[PDB]
Amino acid sequence: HNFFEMWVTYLLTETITWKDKLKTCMNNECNKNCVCFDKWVKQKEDEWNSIKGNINIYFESFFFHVMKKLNKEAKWNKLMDELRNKIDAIELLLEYLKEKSTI
Amino acid sequence: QLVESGGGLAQPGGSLRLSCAASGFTFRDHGMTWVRQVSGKGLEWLSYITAGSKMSYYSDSVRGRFTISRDNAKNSLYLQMNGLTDEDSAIYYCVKGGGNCPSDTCYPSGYFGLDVWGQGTTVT
Amino acid sequence: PSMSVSPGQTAMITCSMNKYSYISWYQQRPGQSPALVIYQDTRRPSGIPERFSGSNSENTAILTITGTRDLDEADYFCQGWDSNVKAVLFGGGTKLTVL
Incomplete structure (x- = not known):
């Protein structure tokens, strides 16, 4: 499941760096980034369907690889706190992406 | 369970090596840590090594002065020192680095913590 | 520092580091590894x-x-992390005295 593990790593890394990029749009000309994020979340839905639990067993085991790509533990804990306040957890993260995509 | 050897007495100078062998643990895919502790004082992290032994971190006082390398076959980790002074008289605990280590991306965070601490040997 | 806390009550041990990292804690029994x-x-x-x-x-x-x-007589250390320098920051530890 090494391809599966690096896919989850890239999913969390791109989720965090799209959270950072949409911070300008969320806090009130970035419509190019909005349609790009919509195409990105549709691509991730299609890729998850091409492939096809809880946070503390499944999302918390890809901490090291994602944190080598990113190196900011506070952003990881903000992501985890937002998913904890929202509620396998892949469906939870994708539902979070759909709810952020429409707004 | 961690077993230790190599501690004792040292004059100022170098050439003193400790050993720590991991018994009953999965030494191949876990990180490994050594932390010293002066008696009556607190902990002080010195060196860390990843699962694949391709990355290693050190403190600001022991970087380059100390060295560390692991043998994944016999499951024994050594710590080698040079230039010992009077401030290095501490209790050196060999520590299993907590977590699971996907590939060699290991670093001793407080996230996974440092789960298993050995008994350690006294360095004078 | 230290806090003289009577048995059965709540101890509030703070490090209050400005940069956020996941903080671990260790119960060091005296003469024993953490x-x-x-x-x-x-x-x-x-x-x-x-x-x-x-x-x-x-x-x-x-x-x-x-x-x-009474078994909680220990020095409890924060385990930080500083990703800028790649060195873990152990806390100074508080002698949590149990009366």
């Missing part, structure tokens, strides 16, 4: 009871010990 108590700021391994609780909010790491016992 052991992992709380990791990922909420979680806890098997073999230790539920009474050790922790959190880190508003840049302050609080290890809430509910029901402090």
